[PDB]
Amino acid sequence: GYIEKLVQVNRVAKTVKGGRIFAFTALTVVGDGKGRVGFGRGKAREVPAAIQKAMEAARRNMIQVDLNGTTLQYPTKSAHGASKVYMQPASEGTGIIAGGAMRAVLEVAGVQNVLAKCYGSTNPVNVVYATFKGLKNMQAPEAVAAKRGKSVEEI
RNA sequence: GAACUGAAGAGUUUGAUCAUGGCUCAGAUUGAACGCUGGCGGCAGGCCUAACACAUGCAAGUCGAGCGGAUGAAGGGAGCU
Known part of the structure; x- marks a missing residue:
């Protein structure tokens, strides 16, 4: 029941003594579709292995x-x-x-x-971090009333 | 009762990355022009340039119940008929 979406697939490389090696990095976001969400990264030599490694990593790091x-x-x-x-x-x-x-x-x-807008750099990995931080710091009205020690009358 | 409800990004510097940073694109529009194509109707628009020169025709006439003269009929009377 987990809906999974692919944000990007990227081809990174590193050089060694003789030629270069190619590695594929994919970042995906997972969630229940109602209240849970999670994002993760995964590096592998091949795309079918790459998008999969992101899958468990995303599902292991989720919030409410x-x-x-x-x-x-x-x-x-x-x-x-x-x-x-x-x-x-x-x-x-x-x-x-x-x-x-x-x-x-x-x-x-x-x-x-x-309604959302991106300002500054639009690196898909970093913007996902930014929206995640905003969604994690999200506060429902009853939580704010608990902080201030009042009812929902503060609205 | 309503006069508001409203915001997307991508490509491109590198062996590869993050940032900065410019360039280009996806949109809306026009008194528009060009190319290909072309059936109709409604509404609208139509010299943005040479405030350049203009043939031709019209675009400011009207009042006789303000006034003087001319033109001078209908209707009648006469030579001729």
């Missing part, structure tokens, strides 16, 4: 994002290493308006109605 329900709660901005990302909640109906690098993350994480 606290969505408002079919959408995100509050407009937030998250950054990780010269990759700035802004995401804003949207009303029912509008699709996933986000870059293809992060569009997989929101769509897999269960978000279906959101």
Whole structure:
């Protein structure tokens, strides 16, 4: 029941005494499609081995994002290493308006109605980190009331 | 009651990477022009340049119930008929 999406497949290389060796790196994002999400990387000599190594690595590193329900709660901005990302909640109906690098993350994480924009560098590995940090730091209203020691009357 | 609901990125420096950084593209539009093609209708638009020169025809006339003269009928009377 885990929906898996491929963000990118990249061909990296290193040089040795005589010629070069080719390695394929793939980064994928996994999640239940409602409340769970996880991303991982994997390097292997071949693409069928490469995309697979990312699979277990993604499923082993997942969190619990606290969505408002079919959408995100509050407009937030998250950054990780010269990759700035802004995401804003949207009303029912509008699709996933986000870059293809992060569009997989929101769509897999269960978000279906959101407005997002990438600022700064658009490296797919780093933007995935940025949106992940924003989604992880997401706070539902009852949690904020617990921090301030009040009811949901703070709204 | 409504006058708002709104934001995508990609390619390209390297053996390969991250960043910075420029270039190019995917969009909307036009009083548009060119090429290929071409059935109709509604609505609209149509010298953006030489405020260059203009043939031709019209685009500012009207009032006789303001005024003077001319043209001077209908209708009647006469030579001839």
